[PDB]
């Protein structure tokens, strides 16, 4: 019943042509919005039936970044409360599509605000280590620098999707002066950094930052030398389950990510490969979560999600049925 | 004036087509060994000035491994003595052909030794994670997998030059299960690992290891987890200059290891790829360091030293003037 | 004035012939319904006598745990609302064996929702190690294997008191797999330890744990060896007036509990047998709290206060006149 | 175009006459009652005008502690409420010499509860440690010392003003026995010290505390020998723009507070002295903070700030423009 | 063929009738002169026959102190000496009878002279807190008392085998007050000990302790306090085959020790009683080591090794044919 | 019997108008020596007897600093050795005279070595951190800026003598640029140190350095922030007596020296005044020790005291009769 835009988005999704715990969150919004534009139900129970099918699918594609069924609980649920109202087909049909961009614009303003909150934490003449690629991290760093702050990053490579080259290129575009480095060097140049700012794709209630592989090991080093850590993060990125005592999932990735299959078909079977794409950093690690409505102790993290999700606690996902 | 299996042995020295501590110094010792053998000096004087040209040209090869250095001083050293006491042309020659296969010999054994002591630390049902590539770590590992102990090692991929392929392609080959993952998944199953045995390149008299970049952040998880972390390394890796206050200086390679010319030239002017080769473990996160001459805690280091180079201070480089 | 069972149901508290906070909490809400339930008051203003008086006697048991104070204050704070409003006789004798009926139901509630909210945190394959016998921690564990999970439990023997006993046969009943070990053995077996699931009498505002003598040690070495130190305790476990800066006295048990008088009258006047109940474990050590309300960080204890005890701090406790 | 007892009200908070975060603030507070009270502008307009040249210039005189403004946000802030509301000449006037009154006086009342629910914290016998000169430290000790509880206080000079003296003969006059040492013993008496209750200029919304210089390394050694650290400060001395990533500035002040100008202009040009008058304490090491809103533990400040200050983010300051 | 008594003395090691590293070193040593003393060999070849019977047959009594196989050693490396240079029955038979004598009563002095230098660590005042049962320690104590310091000692029960209550009263002989407590109470009263002063079964080269179940806990939380941590220990404690690399044994004597079997037969079958007889304190846990050779830092057990056992490594157990 | 130029040197030592433990020891030995060149004694035993008088007067003045004892253990045992030989009257006069200018000058020159050792520990662009007023650190750091390395000096004010004010105007006299900082600045500025180098008047066996107070709390903050500690310290300042179990003992000052007279005599007697001259710095908060013997780890200290001090264990110190 799905659009075929729809299994698009989802496929890129999984293959991380589309990637990043946020712009995944936007495109699983922004699918949900052609799902309804471009639908052909006659009647309303049906659309929403679909709509139901097309969110099942987006929650499926990966994970751990809870951005995206977060992004879902958005749309999908302005569209349940309205359906449950008296929606006509072509009232729904509105509800979705504008609940979708709603979403998808408070995510690119949730980032101009983290930009400017974390920006001034940022001191002139700082120097800035970094892992993978967040446009939030990315944000709190561009805007500082654009704020005529001098600065300097220390990019760390990011294996083994080599995340580290996007940050790398992308902040070499603004004009900032970056220093790219292996992950291993994380510990070697610690003691010349002065801030350390990551972004996250989950974050637990009691503060726990779930973030791309490595993120942990830099955070422990950081601690160690007395350099701060900055989590940036939108509201969205913090996990309401986790609070009902929920695990959240490190997704584990296919083995040729890590090692090219026609290399690895090569190796001795006694050989495995694990491939996680995250891991988990202690909130005692963390010094601040800089989020859209403010900059937070981690331990703070049980009040956004109270503020923000007292929803969840009461229902299923609003798209099960 | 030097032999060619001289120059073109120092060349792959810093290639790194010949790697690894141990073997660097036992290739260091073979040439000295060729160079003597191979010489076509006609008067011993003009032979000794042959042996100090290519002591001096192996030296300047790489810097960070005190084998090199060490291995050289133990063959020139001895010629010195010999040569000052007026040796034949023949004499000498001998002297330091024998020198070299001592030295070569005695490195051999001393892995062997390495192997046995450091085994009776790894119980039976172990999950040890190593970094880079050791034959030293390797011992240890090979022996206890040899007594019939059931062991997996965790080989991390070890970037920029992929000396994890190494260990694991070389592991496996003894049957020994293997785990591979990238440097950044090391505090991830650092919770599931029992035993952290690695090797190194040169130690401080304080106790303090010089090994392959990103050995420290390992350790650091490692002392965070009650996880013991274990040295191999053989009593020429113990650097005896470091007793008169001088540091160990870590070699910076080329940058197109980390990213490769083709790639590199692409990117903008702004961006820098720095790339140390080893890095600094402080020796409170080792737990002990494993030698021919048995284990030791890191504190220890300058016992080690005063009895191998108690005169390796003053006497000038004996492959200088 | 006070009934018979109330009187005795106090004894049985002071001897711990009825322990574990939130077991005596409910016992303490029992005997006031007894009191209510059985008096033969003739007047009203006699009545809400001998209820201040019995719950003033029950509150003079023990003092560690807020549970009691605190389910007295529940039932009370109720009866004196309505008494002071112009509670006919039997209407307060209605208003108190309501509120004690729903406080024995509401305990009991909420030890099964922390059970079900401790479970998810608890993994397939864990070995969780427990100390003393608490119901709150037994019915994570209990609910974690009812689930499916394979676990094995660690009891420690938790003396004086032997309370481990308690526990050991408790988690055999439900086919439980144990290893009982000496308190002493703590550290020795946290290596193999995955998570670390312990109840609690009192929590403070800043988080701080007062639970059972030796918590506070295994909390400690939990933290070394980076393994989860999860708090199962309710609400009420939750002390109120430790934000106005007080502080949890620490019960003093007789020294025969530790050395039996018979053997005790043997030893000289010089050595002298000091017997703490509890200890307290600061924040730091503690990883999460689980609580019928969610899973939250020991510096969110303030959040559980300000919310189920805002009343209470301007008033004083309802048992007195 | 303001009182004169306005400008030199502000002249001695710069030359530190009148010090103390909160005897400044109340100093701040009473400046703008002076200003109301003497003004003689005959226009409504014209006084407002005034008000804010007097606010303005009492916020520019030191910058660190916010208790200055916030004292001043709290008395202005309600001027313009009532101005914009197009109040009297008169009814302003009576508006803003009620709210300087009303926050002096709650300033005062804010000591004395700080002053009961520290005191809770102290037992009988306590060793306790302080730094510089606070009113709301010595409120907590006086009270403590007035229950009958017999202590110790050790007071250490702090320089360069030599603010220990001040505590010192004050906690003196009432009675209490006082150690007096220089700063650099902090670690040396800290084993025989039982509890440190230092005051504070401004708290970060992450629990950061920010106080006379030296707090940061007593907390420091204070954490090394789990001795409790308590920061005594009132509701005004938490940073609300700290919550929109705002660092709080470390007021430098001269050299020759330090080193007296007759000496120093003897010094060769080379040598500088600094002089931060404040530093950082990292929220770890805080235990907890005594406000007259009852005890919290560090990370709880955010809470204190979305309370008092809930709108004291957006609104610009109400004296600008 | 070995005498009656070195049989038994062999069974009451076993079953702890005598236990305490250094009762059972000499227990050992008198043994074995026993077997020489009352043997009827009538051959040489014969005697050392029957003396590397009885060697092997008290080397296999418990594992975890070296105390035990060293002072075989001592006896044993003296009758090889002479035995295999051509010694004479009666010879042979004085050789033993003589090193039997000299350890043990060396090993008398050793305790004598370990606690005269380690009461001048005791000052006037101090709070020692001890555990387990060891004859160093309270040598170390017994000798502070009697030198005029007034002390206190915190014994800890020690359990399975109540040791503590060995302690308490032997203290307590000499006049020394005493305050016994229940292990787990170990981190409740660090707060108030001044000195943590025990004894050791055997001690590795790079500085780990291997004493009675427990220490390690009070170790780890001395530190915390940074409270001294001081093991007394006879060079005979260290451990030589240690240095080769070779791990202490950790003993695991029978459950019902913990659970007497009359109950233990109660018990449900998955109920299982580990009983671990020691555990491993860390080197930096350990602040000094008090020796009859002086006090060294855990990290110089190093020197005593090579400087009492030089000879041993390279030979086979003089009692092994 | 003491010349009169012997007890001037004595009683500039207590004063400290000749201060720090190098050259204390130094003037100690040039005492001796003044005492030989002046002496008036007829006979030999009587010249003897004078010279055992002046040194008992001269380690008398100032207990805390080894070196002076040292110093004097240097001398006086030499001409002890002469004396129990047959020394004739001007022969001993010699002997002294000269042992007592070979220390002297074995002082200025170890001062030099561990000027060259230490300073090749400091890199160009290194931020340097000290306290007080050491010959051996300013040695460390001048010899490595005359080495052409660019260093900043920061100098830590040291009450209550202000011993800062010399080194800053010392090191400023070599061309140094200095920072000078009161004492609680030194964990502001430790973020922005490379290297602590600070000096030592006794050093325990284990590593333990005493030095001027404050250094304790500068080495703390400097391991908490991964900055080196380096103590540059003669052999002669390590503590024989220690390895004993000999406890050194912290010298208590006059109160006037922290509070002159006239300002103390004003200030209520309930308030006491502790001057502690020095403290205790733990062996794991320093990294290396500079001796004109080599770099050391702390727990090396033992090694120094075993070869250069096998003479004070066997007997009293050679003055004493
Ligand atoms: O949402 P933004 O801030 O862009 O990035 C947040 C985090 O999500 C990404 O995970 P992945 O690359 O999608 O697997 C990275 O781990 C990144 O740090
Ligand atoms: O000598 P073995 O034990 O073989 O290995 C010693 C160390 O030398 C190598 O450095 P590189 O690869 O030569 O640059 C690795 O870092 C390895 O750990
Ligand atoms: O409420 P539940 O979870 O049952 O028990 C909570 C705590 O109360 C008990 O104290 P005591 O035995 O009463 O002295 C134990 O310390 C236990 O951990
Ligand atoms: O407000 P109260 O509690 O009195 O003291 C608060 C703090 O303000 C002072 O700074 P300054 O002396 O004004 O520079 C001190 O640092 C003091 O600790
Ligand atoms: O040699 P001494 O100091 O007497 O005792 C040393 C150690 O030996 C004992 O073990 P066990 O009781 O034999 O199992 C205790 O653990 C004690 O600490
Ligand atoms: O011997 P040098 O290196 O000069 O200084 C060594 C130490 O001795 C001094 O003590 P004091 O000032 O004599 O009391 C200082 O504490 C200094 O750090
Ligand atoms: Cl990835
Ligand atoms: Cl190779
Ligand atoms: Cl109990
Ligand atoms: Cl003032
Ligand atoms: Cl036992
Ligand atoms: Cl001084
Ligand atoms: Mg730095
Ligand atoms: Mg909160
Ligand atoms: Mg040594």
């Given at each position: 019943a799905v659009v075929k835009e729809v299994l698009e988005i989802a496929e890129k999704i999984k293959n991380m042509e589309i990637r990043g715990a946020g712009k995944i969150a936007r495109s699983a919004a922004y699918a949900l919005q052609l799902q309804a534009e471009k639908s052909?139900?006659?009647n309303v129970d049906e659309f929403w039936k679909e709509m139901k099918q097309a969110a099942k699918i987006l929650f499926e594609?990966?994970?751990?970044?809870?951005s995206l069924p977060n992004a879902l609980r958005y749309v999908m649920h302005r569209g349940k409360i309205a359906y449950s109202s008296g929606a006509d087909l072509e009232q729904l049909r509105f509800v979705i599509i504008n609940a979708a961009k709603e979403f998808i614009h408070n995510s690119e303003k949730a980032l101009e605000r983290i930009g400017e909150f974390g920006a001034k934490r940022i001191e002139d003449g700082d120097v800035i280590m970094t892992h993978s690629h967040s446009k939030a991290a990315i944000s709190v760093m561009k805007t500082a620098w654009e704020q005529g702050k001098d600065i300097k990053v220390i990019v760390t490579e990011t294996r083994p999707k080599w995340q580290g080259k996007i940050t790398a290129k992308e902040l070499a575009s603004y004009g900032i002066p970056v220093i790219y480095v292996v992950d291993s060097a994380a510990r070697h140049y610690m003691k010349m950094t002065d801030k350390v700012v990551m972004g996250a794709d989950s974050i637990t209630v009691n503060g726990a930052v779930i973030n791309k592989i490595g993120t942990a090991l830099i955070a422990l080093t950081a601690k160690e030398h007395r350099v701060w850590t900055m989590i940036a993060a939108e509201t969205?990125?913090?996990?309401?389950?986790?609070?009902?005592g929920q695990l959240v999932e490190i997704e584990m990735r296919d083995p040729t990510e890590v090692i090219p299959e026609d290399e690895l078909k090569?190796?001795?079977?006694?050989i495995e490969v694990w491939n996680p794409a995250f891991d988990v950093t202690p909130?005692?690690?963390?010094?601040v979560i800089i989020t859209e409505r403010g900059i937070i102790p981690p331990y703070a993290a049980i009040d956004i999600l109270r503020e923000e999700f007292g929803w969840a606690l009461k229902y299923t996902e609003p798209w099960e049925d």
């Amino acid at each position: 019943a799905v659009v075929k835009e729809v299994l698009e988005i989802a496929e890129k999704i999984k293959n991380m042509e589309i990637r990043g715990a946020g712009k995944i969150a936007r495109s699983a919004a922004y699918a949900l919005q052609l799902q309804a534009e471009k639908s052909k139900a006659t009647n309303v129970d049906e659309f929403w039936k679909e709509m139901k099918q097309a969110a099942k699918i987006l929650f499926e594609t990966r994970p751990t970044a809870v951005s995206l069924p977060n992004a879902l609980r958005y749309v999908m649920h302005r569209g349940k409360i309205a359906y449950s109202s008296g929606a006509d087909l072509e009232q729904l049909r509105f509800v979705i599509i504008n609940a979708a961009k709603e979403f998808i614009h408070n995510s690119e303003k949730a980032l101009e605000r983290i930009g400017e909150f974390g920006a001034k934490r940022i001191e002139d003449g700082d120097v800035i280590m970094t892992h993978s690629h967040s446009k939030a991290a990315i944000s709190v760093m561009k805007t500082a620098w654009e704020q005529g702050k001098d600065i300097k990053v220390i990019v760390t490579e990011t294996r083994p999707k080599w995340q580290g080259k996007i940050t790398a290129k992308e902040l070499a575009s603004y004009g900032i002066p970056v220093i790219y480095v292996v992950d291993s060097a994380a510990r070697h140049y610690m003691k010349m950094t002065d801030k350390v700012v990551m972004g996250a794709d989950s974050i637990t209630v009691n503060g726990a930052v779930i973030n791309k592989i490595g993120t942990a090991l830099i955070a422990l080093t950081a601690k160690e030398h007395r350099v701060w850590t900055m989590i940036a993060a939108e509201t969205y990125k913090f996990h309401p389950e986790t609070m009902l005592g929920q695990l959240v999932e490190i997704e584990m990735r296919d083995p040729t990510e890590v090692i090219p299959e026609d290399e690895l078909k090569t190796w001795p079977k006694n050989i495995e490969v694990w491939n996680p794409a995250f891991d988990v950093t202690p909130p005692e690690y963390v010094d601040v979560i800089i989020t859209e409505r403010g900059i937070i102790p981690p331990y703070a993290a049980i009040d956004i999600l109270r503020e923000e999700f007292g929803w969840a606690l009461k229902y299923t996902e609003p798209w099960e049925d």
